[PDB]
């Protein structure tokens, strides 16, 4: 009886602490998704600009005296655009994961 009462109060302390940690962790993940959204919007513009640049370099490389170097620079841009793309995919998964838990939470009530 007296033990049961202490058990209940302990379980309530556990409940409260768990709810607070779940909530703090959700807010932390929200802050990371918000940061991913901004970084991704900025990477998408860099990608577009750089992709166009790289495409022009490789195309026009023949009207250039420094042909070898224009072909080289275009190739280096392509490599870097592959990495940029990889980074954007990760940002997208961070955002996607957050939207998924956000939706699961909204369905709780």
PDB file of C-alpha atoms in Angstrom:
ATOM      1  CA  UNK A   1       0.000   0.000   0.000  1.00  0.00           C
ATOM      2  CA  UNK A   2       2.664   2.482   1.086  1.00  0.00           C
ATOM      3  CA  UNK A   3       5.071   0.855  -1.323  1.00  0.00           C
ATOM      4  CA  UNK A   4       2.518   1.090  -4.121  1.00  0.00           C
ATOM      5  CA  UNK A   5       2.199   4.807  -3.466  1.00  0.00           C
ATOM      6  CA  UNK A   6       5.951   5.298  -3.787  1.00  0.00           C
ATOM      7  CA  UNK A   7       5.986   3.171  -6.916  1.00  0.00           C
ATOM      8  CA  UNK A   8       3.367   5.412  -8.544  1.00  0.00           C
ATOM      9  CA  UNK A   9       5.161   8.635  -7.690  1.00  0.00           C
ATOM     10  CA  UNK A  10       8.399   7.176  -9.067  1.00  0.00           C
ATOM     11  CA  UNK A  11       6.681   6.102 -12.270  1.00  0.00           C
ATOM     12  CA  UNK A  12       5.242   9.620 -12.558  1.00  0.00           C
ATOM     13  CA  UNK A  13       8.693  11.172 -12.196  1.00  0.00           C
ATOM     14  CA  UNK A  14       9.874   8.783 -14.930  1.00  0.00           C
ATOM     15  CA  UNK A  15       6.935   9.722 -17.143  1.00  0.00           C
ATOM     16  CA  UNK A  16       7.602  13.466 -16.758  1.00  0.00           C
ATOM     17  CA  UNK A  17      11.340  13.139 -17.383  1.00  0.00           C
ATOM     18  CA  UNK A  18      10.822  10.906 -20.424  1.00  0.00           C
ATOM     19  CA  UNK A  19       8.264  13.370 -21.928  1.00  0.00           C
ATOM     20  CA  UNK A  20      10.702  16.221 -21.391  1.00  0.00           C
ATOM     21  CA  UNK A  21      13.603  14.352 -23.024  1.00  0.00           C
ATOM     22  CA  UNK A  22      11.426  13.281 -25.976  1.00  0.00           C
ATOM     23  CA  UNK A  23      10.382  16.934 -26.438  1.00  0.00           C
ATOM     24  CA  UNK A  24      13.924  18.357 -26.086  1.00  0.00           C
ATOM     25  CA  UNK A  25      15.221  15.821 -28.567  1.00  0.00           C
ATOM     26  CA  UNK A  26      12.408  16.644 -31.026  1.00  0.00           C
ATOM     27  CA  UNK A  27      13.293  20.353 -30.816  1.00  0.00           C
ATOM     28  CA  UNK A  28      16.939  19.521 -31.402  1.00  0.00           C
ATOM     29  CA  UNK A  29      16.067  17.558 -34.499  1.00  0.00           C
ATOM     30  CA  UNK A  30      13.795  20.448 -35.637  1.00  0.00           C
ATOM     31  CA  UNK A  31      16.714  22.857 -35.305  1.00  0.00           C
ATOM     32  CA  UNK A  32      18.814  20.543 -37.497  1.00  0.00           C
ATOM     33  CA  UNK A  33      16.103  20.248 -40.112  1.00  0.00           C
ATOM     34  CA  UNK A  34      15.718  24.044 -40.191  1.00  0.00           C
ATOM     35  CA  UNK A  35      19.473  24.399 -40.709  1.00  0.00           C
ATOM     36  CA  UNK A  36      19.382  21.694 -43.407  1.00  0.00           C
ATOM     37  CA  UNK A  37      16.574  23.540 -45.248  1.00  0.00           C
ATOM     38  CA  UNK A  38      18.614  26.759 -45.420  1.00  0.00           C
ATOM     39  CA  UNK A  39      21.889  25.032 -46.388  1.00  0.00           C
ATOM     40  CA  UNK A  40      20.100  22.999 -49.036  1.00  0.00           C
ATOM     41  CA  UNK A  41      18.377  26.054 -50.586  1.00  0.00           C
ATOM     42  CA  UNK A  42      21.806  27.707 -50.747  1.00  0.00           C
ATOM     43  CA  UNK A  43      23.461  24.543 -52.198  1.00  0.00           C
ATOM     44  CA  UNK A  44      20.745  24.247 -54.815  1.00  0.00           C
ATOM     45  CA  UNK A  45      21.578  27.686 -56.160  1.00  0.00           C
ATOM     46  CA  UNK A  46      25.330  26.995 -56.092  1.00  0.00           C
ATOM     47  CA  UNK A  47      24.720  23.678 -57.856  1.00  0.00           C
ATOM     48  CA  UNK A  48      22.678  25.319 -60.585  1.00  0.00           C
ATOM     49  CA  UNK A  49      25.178  28.084 -61.163  1.00  0.00           C
ATOM     50  CA  UNK A  50      28.189  25.760 -61.047  1.00  0.00           C
ATOM     51  CA  UNK A  51      26.568  23.135 -63.249  1.00  0.00           C
ATOM     52  CA  UNK A  52      25.924  25.787 -65.934  1.00  0.00           C
ATOM     53  CA  UNK A  53      29.497  27.006 -65.563  1.00  0.00           C
ATOM     54  CA  UNK A  54      30.893  23.481 -65.932  1.00  0.00           C
ATOM     55  CA  UNK A  55      28.696  22.791 -68.942  1.00  0.00           C
ATOM     56  CA  UNK A  56      29.838  25.982 -70.707  1.00  0.00           C
ATOM     57  CA  UNK A  57      33.524  25.243 -69.969  1.00  0.00           C
ATOM     58  CA  UNK A  58      33.386  21.803 -71.525  1.00  0.00           C
ATOM     59  CA  UNK A  59      31.365  22.979 -74.522  1.00  0.00           C
ATOM     60  CA  UNK A  60      33.404  26.066 -75.441  1.00  0.00           C
ATOM     61  CA  UNK A  61      36.707  24.366 -74.681  1.00  0.00           C
ATOM     62  CA  UNK A  62      37.393  24.290 -78.444  1.00  0.00           C
ATOM     63  CA  UNK A  63      37.177  28.027 -79.046  1.00  0.00           C
ATOM     64  CA  UNK A  64      39.934  28.366 -76.428  1.00  0.00           C
ATOM     65  CA  UNK A  65      43.679  28.608 -76.801  1.00  0.00           C
ATOM     66  CA  UNK A  66      43.976  27.011 -73.359  1.00  0.00           C
ATOM     67  CA  UNK A  67      41.831  24.040 -74.346  1.00  0.00           C
ATOM     68  CA  UNK A  68      43.496  21.469 -72.055  1.00  0.00           C
ATOM     69  CA  UNK A  69      42.998  23.699 -69.015  1.00  0.00           C
ATOM     70  CA  UNK A  70      39.357  24.446 -69.857  1.00  0.00           C
ATOM     71  CA  UNK A  71      38.663  20.730 -70.243  1.00  0.00           C
ATOM     72  CA  UNK A  72      40.441  20.123 -66.937  1.00  0.00           C
ATOM     73  CA  UNK A  73      38.554  22.805 -65.022  1.00  0.00           C
ATOM     74  CA  UNK A  74      35.203  21.492 -66.361  1.00  0.00           C
ATOM     75  CA  UNK A  75      36.154  17.978 -65.235  1.00  0.00           C
ATOM     76  CA  UNK A  76      37.129  19.188 -61.778  1.00  0.00           C
ATOM     77  CA  UNK A  77      33.779  21.006 -61.491  1.00  0.00           C
ATOM     78  CA  UNK A  78      31.913  17.814 -62.406  1.00  0.00           C
ATOM     79  CA  UNK A  79      33.726  15.945 -59.612  1.00  0.00           C
ATOM     80  CA  UNK A  80      32.902  18.677 -57.118  1.00  0.00           C
ATOM     81  CA  UNK A  81      29.273  18.832 -58.292  1.00  0.00           C
ATOM     82  CA  UNK A  82      28.989  15.096 -57.495  1.00  0.00           C
ATOM     83  CA  UNK A  83      30.062  15.801 -53.942  1.00  0.00           C
ATOM     84  CA  UNK A  84      27.701  18.809 -53.737  1.00  0.00           C
ATOM     85  CA  UNK A  85      24.912  16.520 -54.858  1.00  0.00           C
ATOM     86  CA  UNK A  86      25.876  13.952 -52.194  1.00  0.00           C
ATOM     87  CA  UNK A  87      25.760  16.662 -49.540  1.00  0.00           C
ATOM     88  CA  UNK A  88      22.317  17.808 -50.739  1.00  0.00           C
ATOM     89  CA  UNK A  89      20.999  14.252 -50.566  1.00  0.00           C
ATOM     90  CA  UNK A  90      22.054  14.036 -46.930  1.00  0.00           C
ATOM     91  CA  UNK A  91      20.407  17.401 -46.173  1.00  0.00           C
ATOM     92  CA  UNK A  92      17.250  16.099 -47.830  1.00  0.00           C
ATOM     93  CA  UNK A  93      17.238  12.952 -45.653  1.00  0.00           C
ATOM     94  CA  UNK A  94      17.674  15.055 -42.512  1.00  0.00           C
ATOM     95  CA  UNK A  95      14.628  17.102 -43.601  1.00  0.00           C
ATOM     96  CA  UNK A  96      12.677  14.007 -44.602  1.00  0.00           C
ATOM     97  CA  UNK A  97      13.311  12.263 -41.289  1.00  0.00           C
ATOM     98  CA  UNK A  98      12.104  15.341 -39.391  1.00  0.00           C
ATOM     99  CA  UNK A  99       8.913  15.621 -41.493  1.00  0.00           C
ATOM    100  CA  UNK A 100       8.210  11.948 -40.756  1.00  0.00           C
ATOM    101  CA  UNK A 101       8.441  12.282 -36.985  1.00  0.00           C
ATOM    102  CA  UNK A 102       6.601  15.596 -37.204  1.00  0.00           C
ATOM    103  CA  UNK A 103       3.696  13.792 -38.983  1.00  0.00           C
ATOM    104  CA  UNK A 104       3.688  10.864 -36.522  1.00  0.00           C
ATOM    105  CA  UNK A 105       3.465  13.370 -33.617  1.00  0.00           C
ATOM    106  CA  UNK A 106       0.587  15.286 -35.262  1.00  0.00           C
ATOM    107  CA  UNK A 107      -1.355  12.053 -35.488  1.00  0.00           C
ATOM    108  CA  UNK A 108      -1.199  11.495 -31.701  1.00  0.00           C
ATOM    109  CA  UNK A 109      -4.057  13.904 -31.025  1.00  0.00           C
TER     110      UNK A 109
END
